[PDB]
């Protein structure tokens, strides 16, 4: 495929944006509250061009449960595109009430309004149960009760991310009755060419019909979908789910529409995955249309981050793409894990990528940071193995 973007000089910048407690400029809230680790990134460019970057602020250690607040940064202006560290505001909080887990940021932009879907659980519960919290208490396993299940929340901003509504619990509307575990995203939702909002979630899409300023939400159930899904519209106008598999190996993919539903999910042997979240992005709709995909391109490691382009109408096949390790960051740990992508207003891919200092190996004390990257399509296309 002829691609004019290759003619641009390759461009890339990369730096830590969410700095764990061990780092020189560790990110803290204005209250003084700091965080051991930041995980689970989500990023969107708003219709103003401002960029909003979200994460889980994991207060005491790197684990998925306990006291976790939903934190964020915005770019200082609507036209800086997050190009340098000095272009980013200080850390802020969307929600951090109680001692429970607020997480799984999954934003979608609708004119303007930013809708941020979130998962929540009580601070005494964890996915497996039996985990020891910092105060000594042993968690109960997430269950099907109102009190012990994973909830689904929506918080909305109508001032370019400056302020956020009190999160609304939409579990009874948008999560099947009798579920225990749940997840939304994490990463992002999308707005279709036809106007609907589609937010990927465990076993389902959350679908916003209506119009901007008057959205109505419902569930499209997807048998065989992952817990952590991604969605985009492909050049043929259909929907594409590319989800984390339940076991390490390969991404699982399904295609469909809002009106007629989805195919079954199948392993995509072109996209190895170690059972980790990934991210997908519709980059552009005219010649040549491109879908971007980002994950760890390995069946056993999260440290093989690879960004790729598909030109196919159904995103069937991707190029080799480029290893993010070709432009490594120093002093922010070993990069790899969950990721999120947006298209900036200056026509770059903006990506957030997890990084792990590994100071406590695989244990809970290992500090986690999140790296911000900008690169043009040329950078991907001019990679050594592409």
Ligand X SMILES: O=C(O)[C@@]1(O)C[C@H](O)[C@@H](O)[C@H]([C@H](O)[C@H](O)CO)O1
182 binds ligand X (CB under 6 A): no
Q: Which lies closer to ligand X via its Cβ, residue 22 or residue 127?
A: 127
Is it true that the peptide bond before 288 is cis, omega within 30 degrees of 0? yes
Give the integer Cα–Cα distance in Å for 220 and 25: 43
248 binds ligand X (CB under 6 A): no
| Lookup: tokens for 282 | 């519709």
Say whether 62 counts as a known binding-site residue: no
228 binds ligand X (CB under 6 A): yes
Q: How far is the CB of 229 from ligand X (least distance, A)?
A: 10
47 binds ligand X (CB under 6 A): no
Q: Which of 21, 219, 227, 258 binds ligand X (CB under 6 A)?
A: 227
Instruction: List the x/- string, 59-88, binding to ligand X by CB under 6 A.
Output: -----x------------------------
Give the integer Cα–Cα distance in Å for 324 and 359: 22
Q: How far is the CB of 242 from ligand X (least distance, A)?
A: 15
DSSP 193-218: TTS-EEEEETTEEEEEEEETTEEEEE
Say whether 69 counts as a known binding-site residue: yes
How many residues bind ligand X (CB under 6 A)? The answer is: 6
Q: Using an 8 Å Cβ cutoff, are 250 and 226 in contact?
A: no
Say whether 270 counts as a known binding-site residue: no
User: Quick one: CA dihedral 75, 51, 118, 123, positive or negative?
Assistant: negative
**330: Cβ–Cβ under 8 A, 6 or more apart, which residues?**
none
Q: Which lies closer to ligand X via its Cβ, residue 5 or residue 53?
A: 53
- Would you tell me how many other CB atoms lie within 10 Å of the CB of residue 227? 16
Q: Which lies closer to ligand X via its Cβ, residue 11 or residue 358?
A: 358
297 binds ligand X (CB under 6 A): no
356 binds ligand X (CB under 6 A): no
β-sheet bridge partners, residue 281: 292
Nearest to 167 by CA among 117, 127, 132: 117
Say whether 98 counts as a known binding-site residue: yes
Give the integer Cα–Cα distance in Å for 315 and 241: 10
Q: Which residues of this protein are in contact with ligand X, per CB under 6 A? A: 40, 64, 127, 183, 227-228
> Which residue ranges make up the annotated binding site for Ca(2+)?
67, 69, 96, 98
């Amino acid at each position: 495929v002829n691609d004019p973007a290759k003619d641009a000089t390759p461009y890339h910048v990369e730096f830590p944006l969410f700095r764990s407690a061990n780092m020189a400029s560790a990110d803290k809230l204005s209250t003084g509250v700091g965080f051991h680790s930041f995980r689970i990134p989500a990023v969107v460019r708003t219709t103003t061009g401002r960029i909003l970057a979200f994460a889980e602020g994991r207060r005491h250690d790197n684990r998925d449960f306990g006291d976790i607040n939903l934190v964020y940064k915005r770019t200082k202006t609507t036209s800086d595109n997050g190009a340098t560290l000095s272009d980013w505001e200080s850390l802020r909080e969307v929600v951090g009430s109680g001692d429970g887990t607020w997480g799984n940021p999954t934003p979608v932009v609708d004119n303007g309004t930013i809708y941020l879907f979130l998962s929540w659980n009580n601070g005494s519960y964890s996915q497996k149960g039996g985990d020891e919290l910092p105060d000594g208490t042993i968690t109960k396993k997430i269950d099907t009760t109102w009190y012990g299940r994973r909830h689904l929340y929506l918080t909305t901003s109508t001032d370019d991310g400056n302020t956020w509504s009190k999160p609304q619990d939409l579990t009874k509307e948008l999560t099947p009755d009798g579920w225990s575990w749940d997840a939304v995203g994490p990463g992002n939702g999308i707005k279709l060419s036809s106007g609907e909002l589609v937010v990927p979630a465990m076993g389902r899409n959350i679908v916003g019909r209506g119009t901007p300023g008057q959205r109505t939400w419902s569930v499209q159930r997807l048998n065989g979908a992952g817990a952590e899904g991604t969605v985009c519209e492909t050049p043929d106008g259909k929907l594409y789910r590319n989800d984390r598999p339940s076991k390490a190996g390969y991404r699982i993919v399904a295609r469909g529409t809002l009106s007629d539903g989805f195919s079954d999910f199948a392993s995509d042997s072109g996209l190895p995955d170690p059972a980790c979240q990934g991210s997908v992005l519709k980059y552009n709709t005219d010649a040549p249309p491109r879908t971007i995909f980002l994950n760890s391109a390995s069946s056993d490691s999260r440290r093989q981050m690879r960004v790729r382009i598909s030109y196919d109408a159904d995103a069937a096949k991707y190029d080799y793409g480029r290893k993010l390790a070709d432009a490594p960051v120093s002093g922010a740990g070993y990069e790899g894990g969950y990721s999120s992508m947006t298209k900036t207003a200056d026509y770059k891919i903006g990506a957030l990528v997890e990084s792990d200092f590994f100071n406590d190996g695989t244990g809970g004390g290992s500090y986690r940071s999140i790296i911000w990257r900008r690169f043009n399509l040329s950078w991907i296309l001019n990679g050594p193995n592409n």
